[PDB]
Design a binder for this molecule. Structure first.
Ligand SMILES: Nc1nc(Nc2ccc(S(N)(=O)=O)cc2)nn1C(=S)Nc1c(F)cccc1F
Ligand SMILES: Nc1nc(Nc2ccc(S(N)(=O)=O)cc2)nn1C(=S)Nc1c(F)cccc1F
Lengths: 288, 288
C-alpha cells in the first residue's frame, strides 16, 4: 500500500539483535539498521494471505501519518515471504508496566504526572486528527532513553478521517439534510467516541499507582460485568495521593460520557501542569 | 469484488431499451435481460481507474446484501471497458417526484400514508442492519407496477457492520474498557446517527405534500444556513392535513436528536397504520 514495501527482504536492511517481547500477533524483535545503526522494534506478523494486509493497514497509516513527539514513528514496513514487517522507532526504556514489574513497585505521583502529561499531549493530537487509540494502557506507553514517553500500539485504533471526508462529501442542494449533519454534529465530529480513551487514561493512571489495573484479582470472565455494575474505580489507598491526582481521575472516570472531560479540558488541569521529566529520568536510571 | 463481474460484456446479457434518467454519475438506462426478458435500471459509471471501484462498493454491497420488499434488489454488476454497470430491479412507475411533476400536483394524504408506511418499513430494516441511507428524498422512492414502493440510491449510504464487527473484536482481559463500550453504547450502536434518516423522512413527506421540499425558493447557497437558523419546517397549508400527519411530522422534524423518534417508535404511530396500497394504485393508474 501507501507505506508497505514489496519484493525486498527486510533483513537486507534491518538486522535482528534479539527479542523485545512476544504476543498474539507473534514475537517483536529488536532490530538495527545495517546502514545507519538506528534501532527499531520489529513486529513480524504471519499473514496467511494478501487479503489480511487490510487488517493491518489502518495501524500502518496512523503510524506513518502522525507527527508528534509522544507518538512512535514508522521507520519501515515490508511484505515479504508471507510476513508483514512493521519497524517502529525504538524506545530504549520499554513499557511502563514492564518497569513496575522489574522494580516491583508502582510509579510515584510525580512520575505519574509526567507520564500523564505527555500521554495526554499524544491523545489530544490523536483526537484532533480524528484518531481513537482504543487500547490505552501502561503496556502501550514506552519510555525513551531521555526520560520521555511515546504512545504505541495502534493495532485496534480508529481513524475517522476518510469517514469524515466521505461524510461531508455531497453534491446538489441538500434540502433533506438533518440539522445535526448541517452543523457538523455527527458522531465522527462529536467528542463522544473519543472519550473512551479518556476513561482508559484514568484506569492506566490507577494501574501506574498500583502496578495492576482495577479488578485484576477477579476471574477475567467477571471483569466486564464488574465495570458495568460498579461505580468508577478509585485509588485503593487514597491518603497516599494528592487531591489533584484524585480530582483528575474523577474527570476521566465518569460514566456519564457527556460529563467526562475531553483531553482538551484535561490539559488545563493542575495535575498535568508540569514541564520537567526529571522524576522519570530518576526512575529509568534505576531500571538501567 | 464479492458482487462485481469481470471480463464479460454486460451487453451480452442485458439489452438497453432506452433511457430512464440522467445525473452526476451519468445516464441511467432501461435494460432488458436477453434471456429472461426481466427489466432493470442500468447505472453505467465511467471510472478513470480501478481504484475508483472502492467508491462504489458500499452501495453494491448494500444492494446485494439487503432482502426486503421495499428495497430495490441488485440483479447484476459488471466492470467492463472502464465502466461499472449496476443493474437494479426495475420499478415501472418511476420516482415519486417524477409522478408529481408529470401530474403537476402533490400526493393526497392517503397516498402519502402508504408511501410513508412502506418507506418506514425499508428504513427500519436498514437501521436494524446498521445501514444509514443518508439521501432519502422523493426522487429516491420508486413506484412498482402494483402500487408499492421501493427505496433506491444507496450511493452515499453508510454500512456500519464491518465497523461494528471490528469494534466488538478484542482479545485479552479488557481492564481499561470504557463502560459505554462495555454496554455496547458506542456511536455505531446508538440511534443517534441513524436518526438523520428520520429527519429526511419528514422533509420528504412535506415534499410529497407540496411537490417541492421546504426552502426550494431560496438561493441554494442559503439553504444549509436556513436549516440551521430556523425552527423545523411545517406544512404550508396546515388546514389541508390531518392532525395525525402533522403529529407524525413533529416526531421526525425535531432538532433535539435524542427527542426525535426512531423508525421503531414511528411504526407504532397512527399515521402509518394502513395496509392497502389502493390510493397509490389510483395514482399510478392516472400517470399511466
Ligand atoms: N517502539 C518500541 N520500542 C520498544 N522498546 C522496547 C520494548 C521492550 C523492551 S523489554 N524486553 O521490555 O526490555 C525494551 C524496549 N518496543 N516498542 C514497541 S512498538 N513495542 C510494542 C508495544 F509497546 C506494544 C505492542 C507491540 C510492540 F511491539
Ligand atoms: N430501480 C429503478 N427503477 C427505475 N425505474 C424508472 C426510472 C425512471 C422512469 S422515468 N424516465 O421517470 O419515466 C421510469 C422508471 N429507476 N430505478 C433506479 S435505481 N433509478 C434511479 C434512482 F431512483 C435514483 C438514482 C439512480 C437511479 F438510477
Amino acid at each position: 500500500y501507501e507505506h508497505v514495501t514489496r519484493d525486498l527482504n527486510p533483513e537486507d536492511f534491518w538486522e535482528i539483535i534479539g527479542e523485545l517481547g512476544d504476543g498474539a500477533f507473534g514475537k517483536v524483535y529488536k532490530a538495527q539498521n545495517k546502514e545507519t545503526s538506528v534501532l527499531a522494534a520489529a513486529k513480524v506478523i504471519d499473514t496467511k494471505s494478501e487479503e489480511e494486509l487490510e487488517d493491518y493497514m489502518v495501524e500502518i497509516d496512523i503510524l506513518a501519518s502522525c507527527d508528534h513527539p509522544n507518538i512512535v514513528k514508522l521507520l519501515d514496513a515490508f511484505y515479504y515471504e508471507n510476513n508483514l514487517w512493521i519497524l517502529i522507532e525504538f524506545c530504549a526504556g520499554g513499557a511502563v508496566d514492564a518497569v513496575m514489574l522489574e522494580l516491583e513497585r508502582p510509579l510515584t505521583e510525580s512520575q505519574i504526572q509526567v507520564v500523564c502529561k505527555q500521554t495526554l499531549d499524544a491523545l489530544n493530537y490523536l483526537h484532533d486528527n480524528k484518531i481513537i487509540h482504543r487500547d490505552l494502557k501502561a503496556g502501550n506507553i514506552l519510555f525513551t532513553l531521555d526520560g520521555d514517553i511515546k504512545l504505541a500500539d495502534f493495532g485496534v485504533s480508529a481513524k475517522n478521517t476518510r469517514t469524515i471526508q466521505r461524510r461531508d462529501s455531497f453534491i446538489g442542494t441538500p434540502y433533506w439534510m438533518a440539522p445535526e449533519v448541517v452543523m457538523c454534529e455527527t458522531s465522527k465530529d462529536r467528542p463522544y467516541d473519543y472519550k473512551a480513551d479518556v476513561w482508559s487514561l484514568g484506569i492506566t493512571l490507577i494501574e501506574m499507582a498500583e502496578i495492576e489495573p482495577p479488578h485484576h484479582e477477579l476471574n477475567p470472565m467477571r471483569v466486564l460485568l464488574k465495570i458495568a455494575k460498579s461505580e468508577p474505580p478509585t485509588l485503593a489507598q487514597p491518603s497516599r495521593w494528592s487531591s489533584n491526582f484524585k480530582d483528575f481521575l474523577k474527570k476521566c472516570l465518569e460514566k456519564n460520557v457527556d460529563a467526562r472531560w475531553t483531553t482538551s479540558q484535561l490539559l488545563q488541569h493542575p495535575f498535568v501542569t508540569v514541564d520537567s521529566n526529571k522524576p522519570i529520568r530518576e526512575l529509568i536510571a534505576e531500571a538501567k
